[PDB]
Ligand binder design. Structure first.
Ligand SMILES: [Ca+2]
Ligand SMILES: [Ca+2]
Ligand SMILES: [Ca+2]
Ligand SMILES: [Ca+2]
Lengths: 138, 373, 373, 373, 373, 138, 138, 138
């Protein structure tokens, strides 16, 4: 486990994100912190970015989830975020499933991409999802 | 309405008298330059050509001073018309009388006909050796003749359209604007700031170079600062504050002119840089086109940058499963570089959206307020 | 309310003591300049005129140091009144004691009566030849007497109206403003920035020129940098960072003064340019009149530019149908040039409307919000 | 649609001809530099190597002038396509013909094969001594060959993507943007202003240094300004307007080049400083993070500053009641300093909130207007 | 969470190794300066004191290179922890390997023990006379030891609080901020821009002055540029771009250092002026107090200016009716001047209201939008 | 009467102030011209400044009234406006009548001011009005 | 017909103006593109500028119409737009028909203009329209 | 008592804060003066800062109260305001009473603080108020 000073500084950051001190980061607190930083996050994006690290799905970020997020964000570059962004920009239709037509389209900027599709479709659902994309990335 | 006709009549006379004051003011300067150049080698001060040419400057000064007196007599009459005065003495203030005498004193300095000489002693530059020469007295009177260039500013103001237009006067009156010589200067520096600074710099270049050569021809026997082309280089390097090199003036007249050039060049170059800086700046309309095309470029770059992320990731996965080590390691190094490159273009795209929203901030505000109406 | 009366009484004494400290501070400087100039040629350091004049500086320094001691004794009493202290020792901090001793040390440097000499060796400029002279010891004590000019800033602050006015103090208190020597400096640079920079530059010009001449009269036997008029030129060209020419100081005192002039002139000229740049800029009211008259001018130009488009087009059509070839070709070249000229004035008019809307953006916002009320 | 195909075909030919004009334009310059350097010591002007190398410049000038003629014949055809003209004479204006002849005159200056000499007399710097030498006539023709660098700007414009892209043309048309050589210059100074100024400064550094050395090798017998490494130092110090030192040119060719370097360096350095100043400025996103962390720092400082206020106050109260005088006095001095320090951090925190609200002003305005919808 | 503990452990080792690299990096520089100064007059290069002191630099370079190797071995391990790599080869890129070798090459240059000499020939300034001397080979190796100052920037970044704080990292992550050496530079130029520029200028002043004196002691036999106090003046005047005077370097090492000083001083002075300009500008809170007190002053001036209008008007009317002519004329001149003075204060008051409304524009907008809620 | 060119330029100015060309300057046209110049004139001030030169009182400015206004405003300084402003700043209460108390007050920034009041009260209404003020000024 | 690369780039521009990809540029898409460029076009001006090149009059811009517009706008200066603007500024009344009084007025900034009117009135309707103006211009 | 000039200047300041001249500074006048200075004071803060020097509690500031406030604010640094601000920042809960837990917390940035509490609780209410804080400060 982390040392005393690291735990203290991570608790300081958590309390910075937790105004009321109830121990969980409500989406309102994250929204007001982001607005204090000059950003204008909508409720949909706020909820989407608060459930990225919400492991238990209760709708709030407790201390272990914040610690995991910090472990993800302490490094200069996070591979998970970049892979997610690449998958997003691949998905032109925005449905969460990159079709074979989009896979062909993103290369023109035949057999190789077909092999990629064959080896990426782990569940055999006829398409590629985010979990398959990150499995292929690693 | 009666004073409206009289005011226009007196302004036309003032404009006409200011034009003839510049004709005779510049004529005396031109003849002074011709006489100064020719009296050095062509003839001497005891020649009849020097008497004839210096009688032209003297005669033109008599006419020039007559036009200055009459012009100020018209300003007295215009003061009486504007202020509703019937006695000319009410216009005579201490500031007005001082400036009337100042213009007469400035415009009455010229080379008097006749040969008078004085002893001029100067310390040579870089050698600190005295140099005594018998100089003419017309050189200390020729240089102040360049002070007649103030009539150029008078002609510029009196020939300006907004100074007398009944439309600019009415619009300016509603906004409490004062139409004086300073307002004309400010409008010139906004319409054509480059032309004003360029014309002033070139005019100062020729005048200062001639003044340096004219003053430093008595104590220069080596054709260093007495050369016109060597005096133009000295004036230009002092203008840019580079230095003096070996062209250090031997006389305090040339040192004073170089000091004046350095002061004017300290501000003229800074103003010129500001003009060029605001001339290389994209306008609001041109910035929207540049941002629109940059956004399309960044969107296309993000497609190829993310495609490289997946292309290297698949090759890395393929080689790792295919019992390949050196190839998988190489494509993992490429995958990390592709992820970093994809992140860099993603961040520079995000900065562009921030810039686009920063400039399009108050225009969107207007649209919302129109909707509320 | 009792401390309000006492605070005003102590401030009046402080203002009165700061005025007399400037009277005796500047008197010692003036007598130092007179004695330094006359001790060179008029008499020698062993004369009774040097003893009498150096006893005037010494006597004025005794009175000046007495006024500094009493002034700081008033600041101790004002500290006790403001902070509600009854013991003077509570005011004695390390920073206060250091600055009290610093002012005494600065104001106690003056030419002591009596003739003492030291050996001054310097390397001549441009020849690198040593020059040993027996210099007086009062020259190394006369130059530091110019450090008494800090009393000018003390007098300026204590004579300032907003420093003690009960209206500026109340308004400033509501806005949490600190009324110190830095606030007075900032208000001076906003009210009269040109006057402050001009007075400072002229005052530095005379003082630095005299210091250069005073230091470089022992090692100058050719009247180069020992001449007051040749030292004013050296200070001015170094101020503008032009160069040194042949006026390179032979002593490290004159090199240090020229270095100080170069540092001050690096910023003074840049600040002066900024003042002039914001002085040549049209105000908001004057820009609306200029834009209004430009709009009328462009509308009239578009009428004549489009009239030339149709005038050349009709002539081109007439000549083409009239079996004319060379004339029709010439008027087609004119028609293309007229179309380009019409487009140019149309584009420069469009840029003016964009500028008009850019400046009139938030005023229109206020009108809409007033309507919604 | 037919003219769309023809316009693209003529633009491809123009781009191809501008590339070959730069190939032969730069080849003649390179051979000129090689021939100038080798004709000094390697061989003489009467050698067959000078005839062979000067016949390469002459042959390349014939081809270069042919490409200039054909390129302008393509611009005539593109003028006819764009303007719907069928006769080439309609394109022939006074401005076009003058610039066609100007380019031919500029590109036709080169060292003609054959040995011709002229007498070159110059005044040596710092000694003012005449120096007469028999110089070749190819030196006054080699320097103007650097004016062929205008073809670089032509290639840059014709190879630019937004100059011909059907997307930038359509977007620019909606915004009434003119795609000319000035628009490309403005976009270069916004995308990569540092790279443009750095490349220009380095290119000018080598070219001006070589021109100074080439002109001042006939009258320099001491390897001062004739040395390439001593000419690079002279160009750089003149670029920064430091001075000349002992590197004052002996010829008016080297004085003119140094004058050109001083003019370019007066603006290039000012533009570079502006680029660096806007590069060290925190962006809007980075300023919000800096202000957020400063606010947390100031809140923590106010907790420790007020804790010192109470800590010293309690110690002062304890010692005062405990019949202690010297200790109570010392802790009252500390209490006053703690109160002043607490006030200082409280004021600098208040200034931070003012700065935070000043930058977050229009974003909050947008949120309110969205709520009203 | 496991990599969080390892990342902090590896960062503490990196910070500890960067501190010891600065201890041994600066120690070698200090011993180099001591050995260079003493090897000139105290002893010779064949002495055991030169061998002992140059063995201290050599020994410290071995330890310094060991700390550089280990520090980069920690950066490899931190790369593996951050990027989830298990093989060290995946971190080895072309850019990383080049910079690892660049640091080793920079930090391995030092005076090798042993006496080796080379022939140094330079051209004296202002005389153009060759000067051949047998110089030590340790002077061309002592100057590059000042390139070890890059470790100062490494220590500054690694000791920075926001580089590792878990609060600044979390806040910066939400705003997509990159915490690199450039972000630390930008925050330093916003917090303390004056301190950064002052420390850099003073540090460059001592280092450049010592480098000039160290290089120009072999070819200076007149104590001109070989004097430390004469080299500090040369560096300062070149920094301010004043000139060179007689202090023109005799060696290309001193010319290169003076060129570097001129480039750094061209931007450092411009940045310093910008810092002072924004430091003399009244804040928003201080401008409201200044405008509030100016408004009260102008209201009081308008009362006395209009009172003079009526006072002079009544006296003019009284004298006119009382059969007085010279007195009535005099008071009509005063009445016109009083009307002009009243108009001037009325116009400068109107300009103040315009300035007050211009600054208070968006704050009033917020109040209206709050009311609509 | 004025010459042809002066009449033409004054008509140009009048048409600048008269958008609809009906021959009279309605207060709306003056208001929109002033707003085009960056000013924000209220209706009360607009009407007050449009009846200053409105001789006939019809509520609009015809060509002769505009010509009189231009004759008043062509000079650099107009004495009538300055005298009016001095009278306004004298009138602290704003009722249009400067009382003797205000006359005494404006001098402190006894017999002489009493003589001024006696010689300025031409109609003997016990106070001083604008017409009396301009009579005393001239 | 155009080559492959030119067709591809013109299709890229058309798709830039056609967000939904339906093959026609609705006035909403043109409006949002113009607003993205900082302009504020009203609906009336938007419709007026969308029917300038709308040959078939269906109310939308298909690919051939966009190609014609691009052929018109690829050159540095388009003569049709300048002639149209000259005709517009000639038409002071804004009714689309320049009367003889306006033709006389625009020259003062008699027989010749009468001959111009006679030779420009091709249909003999007693006035000059835009088609007659462009016929005279060419 | 104060001299004539000091009384005159303090009356000038009071009249600057008193627009209507009724002799009392209503909270509306203070609010409009503060708003003229660029500040945005709420009604709650306005009332709180107007009763700091309101000795009689009538809700308005008369001349003696303004004179006392000026005597407090004429010095460069006022100890009462700084002590009040220190007490405020000590009071995290904002109830006006600093608890022993807060006293312990503000020192970590045991017996000594207990002695401070014992000697500061003059009334023995079990806590520390503002009057006790200023008694301890002096
Ligand atoms: Ca899909
Ligand atoms: Ca009244
Ligand atoms: Ca019509
Ligand atoms: Ca509490």
């Amino acid at each position: 486990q982390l040392t005393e000073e690291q735990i203290a500084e991570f608790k300081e950051a958590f309390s910075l994100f937790d105004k009321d001190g109830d121990g969980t980061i409500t989406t309102k607190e994250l929204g007001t912190v982001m607005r204090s930083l000059g950003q204008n996050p909508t409720e949909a994006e706020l909820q989407d970015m608060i459930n990225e690290v919400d492991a238990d799905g209760n709708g709030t970020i407790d201390f272990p989830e914040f610690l995991t997020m910090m472990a993800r964000k302490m490094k200069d570059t996070d591979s998970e975020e970049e892979i997610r962004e690449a998958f997003r920009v691949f998905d032109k239709d925005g449905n969460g499933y990159i079709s074979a037509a989009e896979l062909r389209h993103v290369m023109t900027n035949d057999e190789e991409v077909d092999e990629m599709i064959r080896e990426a479709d782990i569940d055999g659902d006829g398409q590629v999802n985010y979990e398959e994309f990150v499995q292929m990335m690693t | 309405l009666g004073a409206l006709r009289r005011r226009r009549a007196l302004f036309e006379k003032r404009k006409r008298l200011s034009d003839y004051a510049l004709i005779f003011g510049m004529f005396g300067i031109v003849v002074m330059v011709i006489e100064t150049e020719l009296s050095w080698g062509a003839y001497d001060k005891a020649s009849l050509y020097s008497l004839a040419l210096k009688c032209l400057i003297s005669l033109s000064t008599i006419i020039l001073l007559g036009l200055i007196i009459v012009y100020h007599a018209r300003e007295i009459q215009l003061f009486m018309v504007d202020n509703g005065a019937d006695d000319w003495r009410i216009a005579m203030t201490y500031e007005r009388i001082f400036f009337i005498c100042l213009e007469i004193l400035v415009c009455a300095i010229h080379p008097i006909p006749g040969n008078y000489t004085f002893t001029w002693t100067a310390r040579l530059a870089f050698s600190y050796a005295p140099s005594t020469t018998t100089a003419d007295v017309d050189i200390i009177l020729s240089i102040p003749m360049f002070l007649r260039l103030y009539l150029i500013a008078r002609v510029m103001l009196l020939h300006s359209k907004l100074f007398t237009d009944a439309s600019s006067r009415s619009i300016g009156a509603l906004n409490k604007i004062n139409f004086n010589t300073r307002f004309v200067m400010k409008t010139l520096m906004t319409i054509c700031p480059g032309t004003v600074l360029l014309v002033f710099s070139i005019s100062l270049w020729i005048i200062a170079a001639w003044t340096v050569r004219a003053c430093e021809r008595y104590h220069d026997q080596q054709d260093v600062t007495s050369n016109f082309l060597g005096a133009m280089w000295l004036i230009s390097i002092t203008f840019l504050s580079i230095g003096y090199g070996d062209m250090v003036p031997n006389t305090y007249c040339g040192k004073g002119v170089c000091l004046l050039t350095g002061i004017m060049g300290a501000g003229c170059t800074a103003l010129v840089v500001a003009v060029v800086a605001r001339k290389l700046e994209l306008t609001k309309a041109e910035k929207h086109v540049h941002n629109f095309m940059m956004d399309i470029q960044y969107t296309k770059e993000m497609k190829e940058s993310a495609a490289r992320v997946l292309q290297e990731a698949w090759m890395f996965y393929k080689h790792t499963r295919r019992k390949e080590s050196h190839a998988a390691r190489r494509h993992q190094r490429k995958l990390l570089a592709a992820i970093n490159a994809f992140r860099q273009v993603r961040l520079k795209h995000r900065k562009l959206r921030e810039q686009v929203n920063s400039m399009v901030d108050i225009s969107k505000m207007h649209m919302i307020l129109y909707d509320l109406q």
